Amino acid sequence: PISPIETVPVKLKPGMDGPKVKQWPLTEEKIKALVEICTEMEKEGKISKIGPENPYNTPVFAIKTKWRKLVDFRELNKRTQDFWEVQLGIPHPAGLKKKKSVTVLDVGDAYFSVPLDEDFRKYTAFTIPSINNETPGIRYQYNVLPQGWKGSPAIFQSSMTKILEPFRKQNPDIVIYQYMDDLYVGSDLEIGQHRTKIEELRQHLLRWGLTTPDKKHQKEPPFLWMGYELHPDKWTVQPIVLPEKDSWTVNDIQKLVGKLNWASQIYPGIKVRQLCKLLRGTKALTEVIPLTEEAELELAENREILKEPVHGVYYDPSKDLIAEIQKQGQGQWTYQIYQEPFKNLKTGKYARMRGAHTNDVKQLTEAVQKITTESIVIWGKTPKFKLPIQKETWETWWTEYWQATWIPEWEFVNTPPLVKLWYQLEKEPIVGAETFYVDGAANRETKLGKAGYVTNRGRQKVVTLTDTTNQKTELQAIYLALQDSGLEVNIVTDSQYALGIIQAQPDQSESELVNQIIEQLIKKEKVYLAWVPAHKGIGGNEQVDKLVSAG
Amino acid sequence: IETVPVKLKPGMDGPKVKQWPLTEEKIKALVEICTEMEKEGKISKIGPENPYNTPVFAIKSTKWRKLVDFRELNKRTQDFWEVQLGIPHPAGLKKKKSVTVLDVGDAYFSVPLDEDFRKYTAFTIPSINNETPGIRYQYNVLPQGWKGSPAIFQSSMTKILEPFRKQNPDIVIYQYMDDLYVGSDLEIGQHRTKIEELRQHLLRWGLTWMGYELHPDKWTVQPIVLPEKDSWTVNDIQKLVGKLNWASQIYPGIKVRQLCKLLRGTKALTEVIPLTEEAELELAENREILKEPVHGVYYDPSKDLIAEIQKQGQGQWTYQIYQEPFKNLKTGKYATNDVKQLTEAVQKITTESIVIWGKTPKFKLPIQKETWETWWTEYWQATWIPEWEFVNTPPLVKLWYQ
Ligand SMILES: N#Cc1cc(Cl)cc(Oc2c(Br)ccc(Cc3n[nH]c4nnccc34)c2F)c1
Numbered sequence: 001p002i003s004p005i006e007t008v009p010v011k012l013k014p015g016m017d018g019p020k021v022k023q024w025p026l027t028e029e030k031i032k033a034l035v036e037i038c039t040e041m042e043k044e045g046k047i048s049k050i051g052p053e054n055p056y057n058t059p060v061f062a063i064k065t066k067w068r069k070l071v072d073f074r075e076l077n078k079r080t081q082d083f084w085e086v087q088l089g090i091p092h093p094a095g096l097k098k099k100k101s102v103t104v105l106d107v108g109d110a111y112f113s114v115p116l117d118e119d120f121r122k123y124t125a126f127t128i129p130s131i132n133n134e135t136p137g138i139r140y141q142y143n144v145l146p147q148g149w150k151g152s153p154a155i156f157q158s159s160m161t162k163i164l165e166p167f168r169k170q171n172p173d174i175v176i177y178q179y180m181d182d183l184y185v186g187s188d189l190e191i192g193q194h195r196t197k198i199e200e201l202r203q204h205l206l207r208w209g210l211t212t213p214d215k216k217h218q219k220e221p222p223f224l225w226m227g228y229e230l231h232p233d234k235w236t237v238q239p240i241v242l243p244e245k246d247s248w249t250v251n252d253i254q255k256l257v258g259k260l261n262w263a264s265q266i267y268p269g270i271k272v273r274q275l276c277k278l279l280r281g282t283k284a285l286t287e288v289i290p291l292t293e294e295a296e297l298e299l300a301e302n303r304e305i306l307k308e309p310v311h312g313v314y315y316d317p318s319k320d321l322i323a324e325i326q327k328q329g330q331g332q333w334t335y336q337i338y339q340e341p342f343k344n345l346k347t348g349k350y351a352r353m354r355g356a357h358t359n360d361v362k363q364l365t366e367a368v369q370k371i372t373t374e375s376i377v378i379w380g381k382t383p384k385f386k387l388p389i390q391k392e393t394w395e396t397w398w399t400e401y402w403q404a405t406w407i408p409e410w411e412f413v414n415t416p417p418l419v420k421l422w423y424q425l426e427k428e429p430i431v432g433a434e435t436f437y438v439d440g441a442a443n444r445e446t447k448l449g450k451a452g453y454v455t456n457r458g459r460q461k462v463v464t465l466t467d468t469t470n471q472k473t474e475l476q477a478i479y480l481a482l483q484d485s486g487l488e489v490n491i492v493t494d495s496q497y498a499l500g501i502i503q504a505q506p507d508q509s510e511s512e513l514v515n516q517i518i519e520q521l522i523k524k525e526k527v528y529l530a531w532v533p534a535h536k537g538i539g540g541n542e543q544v545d546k547l548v549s550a551g
Numbered sequence: 552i553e554t555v556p557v558k559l560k561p562g563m564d565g566p567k568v569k570q571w572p573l574t575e576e577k578i579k580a581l582v583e584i585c586t587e588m589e590k591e592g593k594i595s596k597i598g599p600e601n602p603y604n605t606p607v608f609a610i611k612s613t614k615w616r617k618l619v620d621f622r623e624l625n626k627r628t629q630d631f632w633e634v635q636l637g638i639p640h641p642a643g644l645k646k647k648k649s650v651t652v653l654d655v656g657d658a659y660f661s662v663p664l665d666e667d668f669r670k671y672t673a674f675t676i677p678s679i680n681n682e683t684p685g686i687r688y689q690y691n692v693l694p695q696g697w698k699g700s701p702a703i704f705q706s707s708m709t710k711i712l713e714p715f716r717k718q719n720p721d722i723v724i725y726q727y728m729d730d731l732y733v734g735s736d737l738e739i740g741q742h743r744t745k746i747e748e749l750r751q752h753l754l755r756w757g758l759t760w761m762g763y764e765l766h767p768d769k770w771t772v773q774p775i776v777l778p779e780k781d782s783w784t785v786n787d788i789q790k791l792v793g794k795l796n797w798a799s800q801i802y803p804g805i806k807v808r809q810l811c812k813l814l815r816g817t818k819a820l821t822e823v824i825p826l827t828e829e830a831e832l833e834l835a836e837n838r839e840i841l842k843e844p845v846h847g848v849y850y851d852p853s854k855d856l857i858a859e860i861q862k863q864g865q866g867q868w869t870y871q872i873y874q875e876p877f878k879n880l881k882t883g884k885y886a887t888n889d890v891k892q893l894t895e896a897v898q899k900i901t902t903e904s905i906v907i908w909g910k911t912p913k914f915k916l917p918i919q920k921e922t923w924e925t926w927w928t929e930y931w932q933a934t935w936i937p938e939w940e941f942v943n944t945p946p947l948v949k950l951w952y953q
Contacts, residue, residue, distance in 0.1 A: 403862065
């Protein structure tokens with residue numbers, strides 16, 4: 001059928017005329033196949049023969065023992081208006097409410113069962129050429145949504161929405177998920193009440209030009225859908241096999257990481273860090289990469305996690321979501337969401353770096369934010385968090401940090417490793433502590449550098465660096481002062497950059513230097529750090545600047 | 552009442568902005584509201600042949616309210632509402648004893664929108680777990696939050712306020728977006744009596760972090776403040792020289808020569824050090840300068856205002872407004888969680904900016920983008936939304952503003 005639903009009015013882009021692309025002469029077999037395909041479509045209303053006046057054209061091709069007609073709408077697609085996006089996202093199984101009964105209906109010949117705007121049809125002209133293009137071709141235009149045309153997915157979707165609208169109003173507690181050509185229908189009715197409700201949906205649909213499978217042809221649970229398996233009271237990902245290989249190519253590791261990432265939605269504790277490090281990053285597709293011992297270790301832990309099947313549960317909207325997070329080594333976080341303790345709706349991981357330098361409190365906060373968003377998307381509400389950080393540690397951090405930082409309702413859970421701050425900077429100068437005035441200067445052309453200090457105890461020192469930056473020497477200067485220092489020390493720098501880094505209490509860095517500084521800061525008992533304006537002739541700063549600039 | 556033709560520039564296309572995820576209770580609030588508006592003819596369902604989108608939110612009392620974020624449409628339509636139909640901003644409003652803000656956005660819903668412009672007002676109510684495609688609508692009438700609405704309605708607003716202005720020639724009334732700003736020098740009881748009077752006028756045409764009234768004649772600069780100390784350590788003078796070095800960039804006449812002389816060469820930070828007569832004069836003459844506004848900085852109407860905010864701890868926030876960096880037009884401060892406090896400060900600073908300049912600043916916000924974007928509508932009460940971006944506060948600038 002072709003739906004009686006009214007059409008969507010459709011334009012070309014403001015300054016553009018329709019396509020006039022020249023039909024290449026075609027093999028005899030292809031011409032014959034097309035004539036046969038088009039004759040049958042013509043008799044169903046899909047296409048219509050058109051006059052000679054129509055100036056537009058789009059190339060047709062035929063490929064194979066059935067022949068298929070391919071229309072190349074590349075040019076028309078460039079010329080047709082933009083449409084609104086089909087979807088903001090895709091359903092997640094963890095967001096599904098368990099139903100007593102659920103049916104899958106796929107619409108048959110979806111696009112060809114929906115009419116095209118009459119004012120737009122002319123732009124869809126194509127020509128079956130005559131043998132050796134000696135005589136005028138047979139000319140057609142579409143009356144329905146063509147396959148491969150930019151507007152077809154959106155216009156179809158909105159046709160189904162309109163059509164479904166009345167049926168939803170009369171049956172407000174039947175769940176209908178729309179996804180491409182598919183309709184997924186769920187109720188809490190007894191088998192027979194549902195079967196009957198489905199029949200009147202099917203009939204309502206058939207009245208609007210849309211055919212659907214019979215009860216004899218309908219799929220049975222479990223549904224294999226979009227890489228998931230959807231059972232009556234659980235869901236999981238479709239089976240994952242991790243290849244065993246002597247030699248791993250770049251291609252093989254990428255596919256592995258993709259699979260692991262997919263599995264991470266329900267299998268807890270999946271890790272991918274050491275395998276991703278192998279992919280940085282110059283290497284050919286079929287080039288073999290030897291597995292480091294760390295990648296090997298990580299692969300083996302993943303295999304244990306995947307050895308036995310794990311399932312997820314469905315959503316019950318009359319209970320809170322609870323989200324728990326664990327630190328799984330450095331940079332890596334893992335989480336689980338459940339409503340009843342340890343029946344997970346879903347699982348996931350977070351293992352990112354916002355910035356070159358960070359700490360665990362900042363990473364945990366970021367992980368909470370990611371999870372919070374994900375939850376709003378899947379369930380329309382925020383979970384309650386259970387976090388491996390003491391309330392006191394968190395209070396101490398957020399009250400003193402310069403960013404606004406907030407996390408919604410949470411409780412401490414003693415699941416080590418616990419998140420903590422590994423050092424703390426003094427709020428005041430330390431009495432009876434040596435003050436180091438530090439400085440760094442690097443020549444812009446030679447990229448040579450000098451890092452040093454002068455102190456109130458009379459000490460002095462300067463070291464020499466090669467291919468540094470001014471940034472690097474200011475850090476190098478601070479590391480010197482920490483190295484040559486007692487357990488208590490005051491440090492005066494004129495680098496805002498270094499002060500910024502250290503004040504945020506990093507415990508992790510992309511920088512080797514910064515990680516060396518962090519080692520030292522942890523060992524110290526007290527550190528006070530102060531900043532002064534450079535070149536303003538401030539005692540101490542003036543002096544280190546001297547020995548440091550010499551070069 | 553027939554429509555004013557609206558235009559974009561020849562070569563700007565309408566907004567195509569993503570809808571942020573919404574919670575179930577707000578989604579439900581929005582479909583109650585939008586079901587009503589459609590019944591009333593204010594909006595209509597649209598089809599996929601409209602490629603535009605503007606984000607929508609639900610805000611608050613206990614009454615839910617629709618807030619459409621027309622920030623992109625406003626930018627893309629600035630020639631219309633600013634140069635073609637601009638509402639002149641009065642310089643006297645900031646001089647008044649009391650300014651009251653009244654919501655008048657209900658006025659627009661009675662005035663039909665140019666049918667060729669309607670498509671650019673498209674918005675989407677999203678669905679939980681992407682169950683349904685979710686509900687697309689466009690406006691048939693002047694929408695709230697679009698700056699073209701007051702622009703178009705000012706002719707009718709002028710009729711409405713005409714007797715009241717005539718009868719009260721020393722009260723200033725300014726329309727910014729969906730609100731009227733009403734200033735007088737009257738005593739506060741008489742002021743509130745005149746507000747009630749104005750409400751009655753508006754009522755005959757179908758109508759209606761801050762406090763009850765604003766009090767802008769009492770608005771001040773937060774002076775960069777130098778401590779007075781019993782005793783000065785080296786650290787202390789360093790901190791002082793830092794503050795003064797940075798203030799010397801803003802204020803003509805700042806000096807530090809004398810104070811730097813104190814810091815000889817490689818002392819302990821804790822070491823107390825005597826305060827000289829020249830150092831003390833310089834210090835005292837700096838204080839006088841910092842009491843006054845910045846000499847040389849003026850509002851340029853052809854430039855964007857920017858606002859910077861620092862988290863100062865203990866529920867305290869500081870802020871600066873300027874057009875050229877660190878050339879402050881205004882500075883101030885605001886005082887249960889960080890995001891809530893921050894949103895309150897943004898709304899306070901925006902309101903001040905509307906009253907003083909007739910425009911909003913672009914904010915530099917010391918917060919993670921995703922956190923702000925998750926949480927802000929949870930506390931937002933205004934009917935406009937300023938432009939913002941997300942920033943790391945330099946740790947020193949916080950120090951210099953207290
Ligand atoms: N294929 C498929 C498919 C995909 C989706 Cl996203 C949903 C779907 O239908 C369901 C609906 Br509608 C609503 C709930 C569930 C989960 C479920 N509840 N009871 C079931 N019995 N059998 C299978 C799945 C379910 C569904 F699978 C089927």
